[PDB]
Design an enzyme around this catalytic site. Structure first.
Site, PDB file in Angstrom:
ATOM      1  CE  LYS A  26     -41.402 -73.196  54.520  1.00 32.46           C
ATOM      2  NZ  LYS A  26     -41.043 -72.208  55.304  1.00 32.46           N
ATOM      3  CG  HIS A  56     -43.695 -76.462  54.798  1.00 30.63           C
ATOM      4  ND1 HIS A  56     -42.927 -77.107  55.102  1.00 30.63           N
ATOM      5  CD2 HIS A  56     -43.733 -75.580  55.996  1.00 30.63           C
ATOM      6  CE1 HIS A  56     -41.967 -77.450  56.043  1.00 30.63           C
ATOM      7  NE2 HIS A  56     -42.699 -76.128  56.841  1.00 30.63           N
TER       8      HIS A  56
END
Ligand SMILES: NC(=O)c1ccc[n+]([C@@H]2O[C@H](COP(=O)([O-])OP(=O)(O)OC[C@H]3O[C@@H](n4cnc5c(N)ncnc54)[C@H](OP(=O)(O)O)[C@@H]3O)[C@@H](O)[C@H]2O)c1
Ligand SMILES: NC(=O)c1ccc[n+]([C@@H]2O[C@H](COP(=O)([O-])OP(=O)(O)OC[C@H]3O[C@@H](n4cnc5c(N)ncnc54)[C@H](OP(=O)(O)O)[C@@H]3O)[C@@H](O)[C@H]2O)c1
Ligand SMILES: NC(=O)c1ccc[n+]([C@@H]2O[C@H](COP(=O)([O-])OP(=O)(O)OC[C@H]3O[C@@H](n4cnc5c(N)ncnc54)[C@H](OP(=O)(O)O)[C@@H]3O)[C@@H](O)[C@H]2O)c1
Ligand SMILES: NC(=O)c1ccc[n+]([C@@H]2O[C@H](COP(=O)([O-])OP(=O)(O)OC[C@H]3O[C@@H](n4cnc5c(N)ncnc54)[C@H](OP(=O)(O)O)[C@@H]3O)[C@@H](O)[C@H]2O)c1
Lengths: 247, 247, 247, 247
Positions: free
Chosen positions: D137, D133
């Site tokens: 995040k 990601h």
């Protein structure tokens, strides 16, 4: 007409070098020394380069012989701490026609992976290393992944970069890999696999990944032939296959 | 304190450069020239480097102004055939404090991909290029994949290599890609994707793959900032971002 | 206590099945029939399931023996056209305690790849198949890639879908793969590799890829053991390992 | 002629559903309810299915209205604990013409990834999950990766399997991922990336990998249209998009 000898000719790795040499067009296998054969055979048959995959107990003697008979050497055998490298350098002093290459890794693709990872690291904010191996491997992460991470981190430091972007609040234990000089390293252990590595670099809008894959554990011959072919341009001691790559 | 102007400041790419410059710590945005603003603004506000993403019709005039007021330039605008490069070189003659970088590609990861592919190509028998794009792309394969293949093939030729191993008897049409100077190139067209490339190299026991991925089409700012930051060490004309990478 | 015999016990594939059976906890190797041994050995030693990797010339006789002595059979041997399958079905008529599995592919991961590709195909506009093999492979694309493409295309047709999105104007020859029932198939031939496949599906914002990788060409034992373990629930003839997967 | 209303029509996700509905051939957008519009609009314009991306505070009221006016509903809004699902089930009692789909994840490719991972898990000894990601995040690993791991582990337990093969002696902290019900989970945080997952399964000689990639964070419309198109076959409450996939 490069006449080539192989020490450890009957070992796991040595056989593959004998094979490779026999297939080539430019190299002639003039000697295959196993444990019980005199090395004088290399002198008789006029060996010019030797390739050594033997043991740490044998290699210093053999290498001393080779260098003292003017035969250059491509050595994959392990065990070369600083003191041993200093010994090899001492023997090579004032001998402009003799080269030795000591390469702790002869897998041409693992080596290019480390080289390219170091060059790329200046330019990307994010860098992670994922390593994947057969599940009988004892050590995690792999030595190659540790080395690759340390190389990236040294490159980053040399370029004066920040440590990396990450908004993670209380990651679960283990989720973010082993931190190696600030580079996350993840080790996957997977039936069916051999040895693989991925270096992933990231910046705005894009990534670059360098992947290394070995489909079996006995693929050192391309690197070793790079050594044999080029050692005549590298008199003295060189440590690391990367220095023979012309990069 | 690098004072930076942006020509095409309101365009698709120019905005992202204004943003990038504003975020940085070391660069100060002193001018944003759009289509209706006088360039003398760059002189007034004491611009030292300019970044140009405009049109092929505007760029030669603007560049001539910049160079003639001693402002160095980082130019992404396209349209630079040989005759135009010869024009830029002519203007730069005898001006040791002015640099121009013309980069037909500013995506730092596409560029490193081409550079590393050229360096690797000497060492592997097999080399293929796979390129993947959103399915509205008109041209196949992509220009970047064509360039990458031509670079590999030139590297291979320079190293005197064979053409590649393959036992394929009557492959079906299309199965083996488009041959580009002997390098297979496969173009995948896929909903959901943006722009991606993979160069796969292969030899006994192993492969090396270099992957480039863009997660969106407006990620030129890292490359452009490499230009802006370094142009003071590259007086004269340089063509191609690769020459600024210190490789 | 599944007593298992292996026909072709000394062949390339049969050996790996003998090994696998010996490692297991639940299966007992009661017979290893090679070319010169009587099959009555299976009766004597009370074999309950047999595994057959022999030749197309041997297999029908052997199978007829097995079925007629009530021994169930897991057959990897090739050569089974319709007429032969009709022959096996005829022999199995009215014999509720005998099962035969004929699987043209026993690589559990290739099979799951085809199964999952068929299930996914309804839901994505774009679908391409990339296949990669060692460069001595004669045929391109691979039979497995052809089958996988035909399965996707049948799934798409069954769901009434359009043919796929693509704005490509005069693609170069070969760039878009071999079209197989409308699915692009690209074949890569690469030193170092074994046998690999990727099915890539795409829709707005996202992709799904299913990758199959073989790290060597002799990995049929997991699939075959699925057969041996489950054949007692599949009386009669079943063709294809997929039907034993409980999907 | 499926007349469709969208609640939350002006929100981040709702807009994309309005767009998708307008592009389609079979669905007609008869209402776009934002925060200040009466829901009676859906009754007037004869909505048959509604799509809800609103807030946890709004959704129960709206859903109760829809169900009580006989309009079926495809709900992406979050916040549905057991007590809320029990509430929706209570309202649906004895109403054979009304369906509700509550899907905590509408990304068709994430969902197929979980479904296929569960089906594959029976057949492979080794299973790991890698998730990647954007580096903003907060949470690691991702909720989707946790769910995927728990699904694999439940599948493995149901098939009575062992815990997994691994010879690792004193792995460094973090190198082997976060253990989630016995499944290693590695979280990579990388500039340039969006949201990606890989499930890697392994057995003798081979692997199977299922990869999910999102190239941007607003790609829920394919899943939602699966809901809208099929809800007429799913009277009552269904929780999870997987149950609409016909698998
Ligand atoms: N990339 C790398 O640099 C790389 C890669 C792989 C391996 N290695 C290293 O290379 C070495 C060999 O590995 P391997 O896997 O090939 O081991 P191996 O199969 O044990 O082979 C060693 C061989 O050397 C022979 N030998 C021992 N003393 C000798 C002597 N004085 N002269 C000639 N031959 C002699 C051995 O015979 P005996 O059985 O009689 O001793 C045996 O055939 C090891 O140190 C390993 O760590 C390095
Ligand atoms: N890697 C690369 O090197 C790379 C990457 C992407 C794009 N490009 C190239 O970069 C150029 C710009 O692309 P883009 O996508 O940003 O296009 P764009 O959105 O059309 O932007 C061009 C901008 O330049 C302005 N402009 C025109 N004449 C000007 C002048 N004399 N002085 C200042 N501004 C002027 C335009 O305003 P008006 O609307 O009034 O003309 C517009 O804002 C194109 O040539 C494209 O091919 C190169
Ligand atoms: N997924 C699959 O379904 C799959 C995968 C791999 C292979 N195959 C197929 O499986 C078959 C075997 O392949 P392989 O690579 O193992 O070939 P192989 O190494 O030639 O083995 C065949 C073996 O069967 C023996 N044999 C011949 N006639 C026999 C009889 N009447 N009873 C017992 N044994 C007999 C052979 O001995 P002799 O030398 O005396 O004949 C030999 O040991 C081939 O048809 C191949 O196409 C299928
Ligand atoms: N896969 C999934 O299932 C998935 C994926 C993404 C998002 N979600 C969830 O979906 C929901 C919406 O996310 P989002 O990103 O679209 O948020 P958002 O952009 O805030 O949109 C919510 C919209 O609903 C409107 N709204 C509030 N009360 C309403 C009412 N009574 N009737 C009609 N409209 C009303 C809002 O207007 P106001 O500003 O006036 O309140 C706003 O336009 C969230 O719960 C999110 O967690 C689920």
């Amino acid at each position: 007409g490069i006449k080539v000898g192989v020490l450890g000719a009957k070992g796991r790795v040595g056989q593959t070098i004998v094979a490779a040499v026999n297939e080539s067009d430019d190299l002639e296998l003039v000697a295959e020394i196993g444990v019980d054969d005199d090395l004088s055979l290399l002198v008789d048959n006029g060996a010019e380069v030797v390739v050594d995959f033997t043991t740490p107990n044998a290699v210093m003697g053999n290498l001393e012989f080779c260098i003292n008979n003017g035969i250059s050497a491509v050595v994959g055998t392990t065990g070369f701490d600083d003191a041993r490298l200093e010994q090899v350098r001492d023997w090579l002093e004032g001998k402009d026609n003799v080269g030795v290459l000591i390469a702790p890794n002869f897998a041409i693709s693992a080596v290019l992976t480390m080289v390219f990872s170091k060059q790329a690291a200046r330019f990307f904010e994010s860098a992670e290393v994922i390593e994947l191996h057969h599940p009988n491997k004892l050590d995690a992460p792999s030595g190659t992944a540790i080395h690759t991470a340390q190389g990236i981190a040294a490159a980053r430091k040399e370029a004066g970069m920040d440590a990396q972007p990450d908004a993670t609040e209380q990651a679960l234990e283990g989720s973010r890999g082993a931190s190696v000089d600030g580079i996350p390293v993840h080790a996957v252990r997977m039936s069916g696999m051999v040895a693989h590595e991925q270096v992933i670099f990231g910046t705005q809008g894009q990534t670059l990944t360098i992947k290394q894959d070995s489909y079996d554990r006995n693929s050192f011959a391309p690197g070793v032939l790079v050594g044999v072919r080029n050692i005549a341009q590298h008199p003295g001691l060189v440590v690391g296959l990367e220095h023979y790559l012309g990069l």
